[PDB]
Structure formats: structure tokens, C-alpha cells
């Protein structure tokens, strides 16, 4: 039970963070941050400066 609901919640958190980065790139930042890698449920990697 812990494995199933912990894995789902953590990948949900990663999906929320990816959606937030797409909001920041579209609205206010824009090429000051870029998504390098995104594997859904596995990893997210952003590039600044």
C-alpha cells in the first residue's frame, strides 16, 4: 500500500512541477529556464543561466 500510494504521489508531484515550469516558460521567464530532460515519473531537469 505504501509503495503504490507513495510512487503515485511522487510522480504526481513531478507532473505538477513540470506543469509549473511550462507555465513559467510560457508566461514570465521564457528562455531564462529550459527543460533539459523530462521522463514522466522518473526525472525532471532544468537549465538556468
Amino acid at each position: 500500500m505504501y509503495n503504490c500510494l507513495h510512487s503515485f504521489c511522487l510522480s504526481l508531484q513531478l507532473e505538477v512541477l513540470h506543469s509549473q515550469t511550462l507555465m513559467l516558460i510560457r508566461e514570465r521567464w521564457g528562455d531564462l529556464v529550459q527543460v533539459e530532460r523530462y521522463h514522466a515519473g522518473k526525472c525532471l531537469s532544468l537549465s538556468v543561466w
Binding site: N3, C4, S7, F8, S11, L12, E15, S19, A40, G41
Partner: peptide, 25 residues
Amino acid sequence: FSSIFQRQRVDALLLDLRQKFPPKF
């Protein structure tokens, strides 16, 4: 006499949960 349209991503995550954790009767 709704659906907030961020549910595509949640649904793909549900399918990944189905695969990563299968149901067991």
C-alpha cells in the same frame, strides 16, 4: 406524481500506475 483538463496527465499517470502496480483479485 467537472474535469479541469489536467486530467490527461493524471490519466496517463493512472495507466503507469496500472502497469507498475497490477490489480490482484
